[PDB]
């Protein structure tokens, strides 16, 4: 694309420039042009590319519930036009663009390519993340396959992640967390994210005894995102 | 309070 | 435009949501959509004309400024190659087409159909501002240009505001504050900064048993951020 | 602590 006039090693360097920079368009740019080259992704860039898309997505769904809020009061109130479902069918048709795009990278090639229990997990949160993204805004006939997509790249993940990583792993843990919230919110399963987000924890701090203090300072982190919604659902 | 899901 | 096809209200009304939203840039467009549809601009309408194209820039501005930083710092340092460079380019050009928008919109037509005080004040002083955000980021033998541009627009708003506002006036205010900003840091006159600074203050004290209790919180909330100079630069 | 302009 745009970016195939770019050494990847320049894109690695930019990328990391606007994080630093807090111009996350441009990194998520700077990162796709890497995966375009068609090299696989180290752990670090790996993270350059969730961190980049996390901030563009991230933006556009806060946005989205705004908008949504606002045409969700309209319709209870004075007749103001087409303008708040215009413009937030244009937010939802940029959120979804995003998403098909990350999307897109996962299935070419990224995911096929990806061997290694660390890589090939990660790749399906993603996967599972943004087809979550895409059922946060979805009203018609496709809901509930776009519903199973997640589902299923999720649990994928999982079933790997049990295999191949202990259970103090961030990325296991990062899987189960965001897995639990498709449960409570998406799924339609209170239950089901409860369990699931207290297991984790348990087996979690079972195995903590085994962790260096820098790998202790990783999981504990996650750990307590897990029981800020324990809290907060139970 | 909105729940977490895993991000920075 | 891109805007050509939709109405004068209907721009209007989504740039109230897109800055609910946070989304800044299709606050810009919208706003530019409306200023080209070719009829002055009321109070409110300046205002979201303002707020939105000074987020816009404002990003810009705080990215231009680390990257500006990290650059610095290389030509202290090890050879990186020309990709910090490239991208602090990449920043300011983006940033220099954001401030050539908006003195367009300023040349053709704002400035010369505005006939009241706060109207062409208002729009000088955006003049003055954008010329100010060129020359934050100017090396080259333009520099002296794009700084006397700045001055005189701020100028000739200042020539205005003496006469035609009382000192309490908010726009008069913030007028003056963004004066001796560009006393201070753009023209090098800090003694000219403060100078300004403290005048428009004093004669803005002389002034508040003039006003209603709202007109009074209005003009302190502006003294102060002139104070908050003063107390910085003295 | 970085100098105020007209902002909001
Ligand atoms: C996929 C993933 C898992 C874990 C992290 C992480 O260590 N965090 C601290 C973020 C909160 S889960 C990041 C990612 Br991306
Ligand atoms: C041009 C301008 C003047 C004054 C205001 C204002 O009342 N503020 C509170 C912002 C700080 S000066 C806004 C604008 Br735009
Ligand atoms: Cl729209
Ligand atoms: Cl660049
Ligand atoms: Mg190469
Ligand atoms: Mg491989
Ligand atoms: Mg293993
Ligand atoms: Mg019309
Ligand atoms: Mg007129
Ligand atoms: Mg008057």
New interface residues.
Partial sequence: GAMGSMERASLIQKAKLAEQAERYEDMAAFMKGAVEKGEELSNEERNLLS?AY?NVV?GQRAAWRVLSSIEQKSNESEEKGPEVREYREKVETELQGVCDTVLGLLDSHLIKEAGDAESRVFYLKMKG?YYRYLAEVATGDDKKRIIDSARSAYQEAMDISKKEMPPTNPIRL??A??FS?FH??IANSPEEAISLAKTTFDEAMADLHTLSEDSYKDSTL?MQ?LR??LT??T | ?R??????
Same sequence: chains 1, 3.
Wanted: glycine residues 8%; contains cysteine.
């Fill in positions: 961190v996390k991230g993340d990062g899987l967390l965001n919230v409570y919110e996650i995102l800020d919604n907060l659902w | 309070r729940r977490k899901s895993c991000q920075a």
